[PDB]
Amino acid sequence: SLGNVLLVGLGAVAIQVALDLRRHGAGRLGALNHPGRRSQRIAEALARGACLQLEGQGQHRWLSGNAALDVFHQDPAELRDDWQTLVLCVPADSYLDVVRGLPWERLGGVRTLLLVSAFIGANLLVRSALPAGCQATVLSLSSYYAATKVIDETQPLRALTKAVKRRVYLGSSRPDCPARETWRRVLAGSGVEVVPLATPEAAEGRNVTTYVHSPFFLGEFALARILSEQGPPGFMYKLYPEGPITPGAIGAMRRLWCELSELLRRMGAEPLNLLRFLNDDNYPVHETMLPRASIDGFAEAGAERQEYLLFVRYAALLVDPFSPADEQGRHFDFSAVPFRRVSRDEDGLWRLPRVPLEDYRKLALIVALAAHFDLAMPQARSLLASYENAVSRFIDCQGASQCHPSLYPIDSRPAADAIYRQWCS
Amino acid sequence: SLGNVLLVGLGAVAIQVALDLRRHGAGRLGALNHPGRRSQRIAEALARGACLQLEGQGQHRWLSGNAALDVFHQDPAELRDDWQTLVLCVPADSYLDVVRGLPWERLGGVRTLLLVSAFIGANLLVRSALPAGCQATVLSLSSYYAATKVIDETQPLRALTKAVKRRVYLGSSRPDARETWRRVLAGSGVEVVPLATPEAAEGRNVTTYVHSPFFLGEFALARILSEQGPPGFMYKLYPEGPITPGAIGAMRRLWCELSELLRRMGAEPLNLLRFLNDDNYPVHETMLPRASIDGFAEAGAERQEYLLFVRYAALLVDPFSPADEQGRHFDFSAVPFRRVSRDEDGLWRLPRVPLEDYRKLALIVALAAHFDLAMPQARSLLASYENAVSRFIDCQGASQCHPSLYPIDSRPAADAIYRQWCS
């Protein structure tokens, strides 16, 4: 079964996962979060008797519930060998740091480790970092299965889920893995269909953010908003000049999808139909905007038609076409998600938001991995260079002394080498 | 060169034109407005000392001015042969009726007749109704050159111009008066481009290309014929408005059909995307690259449809408007549909959009048949309108509907245009 489950990272994702785990049952539920203001707030909340609370928004209100946490650690030194399942709810660009940091000498009983938002190569990278002879199976979930936020960091244990995906995918380092069905059941509790796939990379190849955030949020427009201090933040899914979506961004999306598909084929994984994945698995539009024949036929449509269809898809979602119309015939403004921007941390250093720092670090690793398969990925490299140039100019202007080192050049070649060696073994 | 000018149809357009004529310099100013309540109000206002009053809104406030009306008629038979220039400021559907009603055999002094909103064939249709040997030159303007309205029908001669177009085109029945009218209209700020034939100007009417595919389709007609529910928006994407990839396909296919008709009538067609961007409302290079705009006519159908869709998506907000504090731009696309309304006799009427658009396209299709052009896309749009309006009549009752909703036959007008063109 799942046995006793340790959530690693206790954020918005973990709270939703905790609700789904408690519905399913069968064991103690613990969490580990590294020291910091959030962990201090969490420990304070738990010590006064608070529980994890998940609220569903709008149509998702049926999800809402509370979940008890048996133990919370902000000090790995107190962990003992009581855990059968680890669930990594930390940012995906931290999986390597987090897996190296776990006290594996006291975790010999762990039999499964789930990566809740994997990317191509993540399963292999995590396996490369495990201690020798570790017999934990590593599971890769394609994408986090919802949209969830901690409303008010002052109540760190209360989260809001505003969207839920129709379908996600799950692969395992163990062939014909029985744990996949367990997690199918756990996530089905929140209405998500989990499709088991035959290898981790096939699931990782269905990570939605890799395909969408890379072309849209590594470009010039997004970076100009994210690195700004004054002026409006702009909107993540609007068309230029309100947001980053342009025909050029759509062309980058198509070309990157082609590059990623070839990488997947070279790792023995079947690529996805990008339009059908976006429409059917994540969020749909009406037949009059995207005919089913166009959705199903997308992969054979030819580049111009593919780009037209992708553009239509995003223009069709500037509002939510399935939301109720208001008195004046308008639908919900689905595309008005503001960009989060750079902000100063407690040491006075500029930090980047997760979008795009996490998206850059993921894509940089994928590109470094693809080089081992003799794939140059020029579109991916152009997106990396756009981010790097913009951030470099921000450092020039603000001063290196004022910038957190996460803004600085990162070397992904060592991690890519570890992944490739693990794949070849 | 203008002499004494008679404005036929004394409404919003005529008031703007009168003030532009006065800025340029003209003789007496007269007007002919057919009997009706508007003419009754005009006659009383004139009796109490009213003049033609034009107000320019905002940046166009320099357009504002007053002009005396020297003569007002309602009955064409009462016109004296004292007019060198006639300007037709009536709806284009009425041009033939207006011309047939005038006593041309005793209007030998008329030298110029200007059609302010000429549809394809309008010049030829007008000339077909003129007596043989009639001396008048007929001018076709591609479209009215501003956006103007009578503020309040209780002060009938006071009009408001809220916008002026960038560019219009002017063609003449006489090879090589265009220059005079280019100057006159240039006083409003519009650039008038003289073209070599009337049909070249008539073929540059923007509503022909845009209103036909968007407002004769099923979505638009469902809004227009509706009584309850929100009216929807003319230029938003489905489900808020009628713009869909199917509507854009209709737009492209119709542009191809219209372009071939123009070529068969000896007129160079337009590059639709360049015409929309450069003559109507532009977008940024990142949405529509200049090379894609200039190259549109040679791009191939899929790219052409993608570019047109991008153009309308890019204008859901006005990208050159100032951003508000939230990074939002002006909601340019939220122009509500005008819908059916009961008239003073209690009868349902259609708004000019799409009635005028249907009538124009019906004539174009009937004309195209003479050039052996079937215009299947145009015919599909006509059928869409006819079927929807027919079902509205079924539901409301013919006795409750104004006769303008009933079937029309444009074949006699098309035949007269073709005969004139072959003359």
Ligand SMILES: NC(=O)c1ccc[n+]([C@@H]2O[C@H](COP(=O)([O-])OP(=O)(O)OC[C@H]3O[C@@H](n4cnc5c(N)ncnc54)[C@H](OP(=O)(O)O)[C@@H]3O)[C@@H](O)[C@H]2O)c1
């Ligand atoms: N929430 C969503 O809807 C969503 C959507 C798409 C994808 N995702 C994926 O899920 C991941 C987690 O999302 P979330 O909303 O739960 O974020 P959250 O606010 O960041 O919670 C993440 C937890 O992990 C801790 N953490 C962050 N960085 C860490 C690091 N380098 N090492 C160890 N612990 C770290 C955090 O504690 P501290 O704050 O103290 O560091 C926090 O408790 C995202 O990064 C993304 O990969 C989530």
Ligand SMILES: NC(=O)c1ccc[n+]([C@@H]2O[C@H](COP(=O)([O-])OP(=O)(O)OC[C@H]3O[C@@H](n4cnc5c(N)ncnc54)[C@H](OP(=O)(O)O)[C@@H]3O)[C@@H](O)[C@H]2O)c1
């Ligand atoms: N900004 C604009 O105003 C604009 C823009 C683009 C296109 N147009 C087109 O230009 C045409 C005229 O526009 P408008 O705004 O000036 O209309 P308007 O204000 O209603 O004026 C039309 C005038 O002509 C009269 N009239 C109609 N038929 C007549 C006839 N057969 N003989 C004599 N007088 C007649 C009308 O009187 P009754 O009201 O009694 O019929 C009215 O006084 C319209 O079809 C319009 O769609 C106008």
Ligand SMILES: N[C@@H](CCN[C@@H](Cc1cnc[nH]1)C(=O)O)C(=O)O
């Ligand atoms: N947020 C997603 C990334 C995909 N975003 C959606 C678009 C969208 C989301 N909200 C408003 N518009 C998509 O691109 O189809 C995730 O990673 O789960």
Ligand SMILES: O=C(O)CCC(=O)C(=O)O
């Ligand atoms: O869905 C959003 O609102 C932002 C895009 C996204 O996928 C994310 O939160 O990582």
